[PDB]
Design a protein around this ligand. Structure first.
Ligand code: HEM
Length: 154
């Protein structure tokens, strides 16, 4: 259980409500960053319907990137309310299984975090601050800690 004030929830929730308006562009930007920092991640998205696809063309990118934002936002709300992330067990186990199936490791989560933080920094420059950065980072960290615990565990 951590301290997470409603001020902190509000930074995440309010910035997301702004960014949500251009979420198509934003999700693309997120993956373009990740793909640049670590091109090996491209091959996690290089096959669609049992056939090669260039990873940037993959229709799962935008809903995937959307998921990252939405679930961090939900996690911010949960942290403030309960001091922890709680994802219904079955969905969490599935999230664990899905990521480990695709060979996602710590470094990928670290690269995505850095990329997520930079995309936010650039999407909402007049809301950006060290505390904004802490609030999204904390939400991401705890979400990923929960998913990881189902990647380690069987
Ligand atoms: C906050 C962290 C993350 C969240 C919330 C998230 C969200 C999701 C969701 C909802 C799915 C679909 C799960 C399913 O239907 O079983 C998924 C699958 C996937 N994710 Fe993530 N993800 C995260 C981090 C990452 C990272 C860092 C990578 C690698 C760069 C990654 C790569 C993948 C891959 C390869 C799949 C499988 C997609 C497919 O089935 O074609 N994820 N993720």
């Amino acid at each position: 259980k951590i301290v997470f004030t409603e001020e902190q929830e509000a930074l995440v929730v309010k910035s997301w409500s702004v960014m949500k308006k251009n979420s198509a562009e934003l999700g693309l930007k997120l993956f373009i960053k990740i793909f640049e920092i670590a091109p090996t991640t491209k091959k996690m998205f290089s096959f669609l319907r049992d056939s090669p696809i260039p990873a940037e063309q993959n229709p799962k990118l935008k809903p995937h990137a959307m998921s990252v934002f939405v679930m961090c936002c939900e996690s911010a709300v949960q942290l403030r309310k309960t001091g922890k992330v709680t994802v219904r067990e079955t969905t969490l186990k599935r999230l664990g299984a899905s990521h480990s199936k695709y060979g996602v490791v710590d470094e990928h989560f670290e690269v995505a975090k850095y990329a997520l933080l930079e995309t936010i920094k650039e999407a909402v420059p007049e809301m950006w601050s060290p505390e904004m950065k802490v609030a999204w980072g904390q939400a991401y960290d705890h979400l990923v800690a929960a998913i990881k615990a189902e990647m380690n565990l069987s």
